[PDB]
Amino acid sequence: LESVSNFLKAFLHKARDDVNVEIVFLHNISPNLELEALFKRHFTQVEFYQGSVLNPHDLARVKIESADACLILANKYCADPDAEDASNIMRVISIKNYHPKIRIITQMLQYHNKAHLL
Amino acid sequence: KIQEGTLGFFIASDAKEVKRAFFYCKACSNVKKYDSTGMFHWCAPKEIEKVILTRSEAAMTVLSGHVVVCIFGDVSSALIGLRNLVMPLRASNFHYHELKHIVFVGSIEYLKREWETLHNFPKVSILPGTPLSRADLRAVNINLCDMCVILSANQNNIDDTSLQDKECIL
C-alpha cells in the first residue's frame, strides 16, 4: 500500500498533463482491502495482476515485449538491504532474459550493489 | 574373468537392444598416508589456524590447476556435507601429485563448524572472505583454477523459491 501510494502520487499527478501510459502492477501477493481500494480509485489507468516477474509465463501475461518500460520498486525498510538488492538484480536478470531490449528503471538500496548491474 | 551369471550395466537406447545381450551365442619412513581401508588419502589432523590463508599470503602463493569452492554460509546456516565433496577428490587412485588443491572461499565461522570432518585430508586451504568479492577471487587465482564450484551453502533459506539462487547467480 505504501510504496504503490507514493508511486501513484508522484506519477499519476493532477498537475501532470501528458499521461497516455497505463500502469500495470505484477506481484505474487494478493492485495489487502486498502490496496484493492487504492487500485479501484485509479481503475481507469491502473491494473494489477497476481504473478511473479521471475516467471516467464507471468512476463508473457503482462506483455513485457510491448511494455514501454519496467520500473522496479525496492523495500526501503528491510532487515537486510543486500538481500533485497540481490532480489531486485535477479528480477532485472529475469526481465532482460525474457526481453533484452526493454528499458528498466530499478530502485537500489546500497551503492556497492549497483556494481552487480554491470 | 566373468563367472556364472553376472549383472552387466549397459548404456543403450532401448531395453529391446539390451535384451540382445542375454540372447547371444558364439555360433548359434613409516608414516600413515591412507585411511584404514586405503580407499581415500589421509593426513594427520591439522588445526584450522594452520590452513587459513590471508589475501596477501594467498596472493604470494601460486595456485594453478586447483579447485576453488565458493560457499555462501554463516554461523547459523544449515550444514551441507562438504566431506562428500572432498572424499571423491582424494580417492587413493589419483597419485599424490595428481591431487588438486581445494581452496574454500567463504565465512570462516561456517567453515569452523565443518572443519572437524575435513582436517584429515592432504591439501585443503581456507580463505576467509566472500565469494562475491573480486579481490578475494583474484587472490585465489580464479583464472588459473581447474574448476570453480559455487555452492548454495545457505540452502536453509525459505523465500520466494525463484529468489533462492540469487547469490549463486550473482
Side-chain angles (χ1 to χ4, degrees), chain B residues 77-78 152-159 163-167:
Chain B
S77 176
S152 63
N154 201 350
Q155 64 204 0
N156 59 273
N157 51 18
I158 289 175
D159 197 19
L163 297 165
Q164 213 194 310
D165 300 327
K166 65 174 77 68
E167 293 179 353

Side-chain angles (χ1 to χ4, degrees), chain A residues 100-118:
Chain A
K101 289 279 175 284
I102 189 170
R103 178 215 188 168
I104 293 179
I105 308 164
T106 177
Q107 284 180 354
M108 304 280 292
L109 296 169
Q110 295 274 44
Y111 179 69
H112 43 271
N113 301 322
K114 288 208 306 168
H116 294 120
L117 286 173
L118 294 173

Side-chain angles (χ1 to χ4, degrees), chain A residues 4-66:
Chain A
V4 172
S5 181
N6 307 337
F7 179 79
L8 287 194
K9 290 199 250 154
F11 203 98
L12 293 187
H13 206 276
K14 189 67 177 179
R16 192 157 257 130
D17 197 359
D18 186 356
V19 290
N20 306 133
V21 289
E22 174 148 21
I23 318 298
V24 182
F25 292 90
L26 177 61
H27 195 196
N28 56 10
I29 294 173
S30 176
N32 48 13
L33 274 299
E34 302 216 39
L35 197 47
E36 311 206 60
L38 173 57
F39 285 143
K40 273 203 292 303
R41 183 150 62 274
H42 301 273
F43 69 97
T44 180
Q45 45 194 353
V46 170
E47 282 185 349
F48 178 88
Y49 290 107
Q50 177 155 50
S52 184
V53 75
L54 298 145
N55 201 359
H57 189 40
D58 301 340
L59 290 181
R61 293 211 278 118
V62 293
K63 308 297 198 305
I64 292 295
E65 52 275 359
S66 297

Side-chain angles (χ1 to χ4, degrees), chain A residues 28 54 86-87 89-91, chain B residues 132 160 162-163 166 169-170:
Chain A
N28 56 10
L54 298 145
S87 311
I89 294 162
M90 184 144 169
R91 297 184 161 94
Chain B
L132 285 157
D160 298 331
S162 292
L163 297 165
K166 65 174 77 68
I169 298 293
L170 289 202

Side-chain angles (χ1 to χ4, degrees), chain B residues 41 65 94-101 123:
Chain B
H41 283 274
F94 323 125
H95 306 274
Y96 189 87
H97 76 261
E98 291 198 343
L99 295 186
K100 308 201 181 150
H101 204 103
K123 40 184 73 170

Side-chain angles (χ1 to χ4, degrees), chain B residues 59-139:
Chain B
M60 311 275 168
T61 312
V62 65
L63 293 171
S64 190
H66 59 303
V67 169
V68 178
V69 181
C70 313
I71 60 170
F72 300 90
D74 55 349
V75 64
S76 57
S77 176
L79 283 185
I80 67 177
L82 292 169
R83 187 179 49 199
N84 307 314
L85 173 66
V86 181
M87 277 195 327
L89 290 180
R90 312 281 191 255
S92 285
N93 53 328
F94 323 125
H95 306 274
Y96 189 87
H97 76 261
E98 291 198 343
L99 295 186
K100 308 201 181 150
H101 204 103
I102 304 171
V103 182
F104 285 100
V105 185
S107 184
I108 189 51
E109 282 274 289
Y110 176 85
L111 282 165
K112 279 211 301 282
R113 298 172 64 194
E114 270 192 84
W115 184 252
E116 71 176 20
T117 56
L118 266 67
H119 52 64
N120 276 331
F121 286 108
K123 40 184 73 170
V124 167
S125 301
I126 290 171
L127 188 141
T130 303
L132 285 157
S133 176
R134 292 207 180 183
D136 280 323
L137 296 171
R138 275 196 163 91

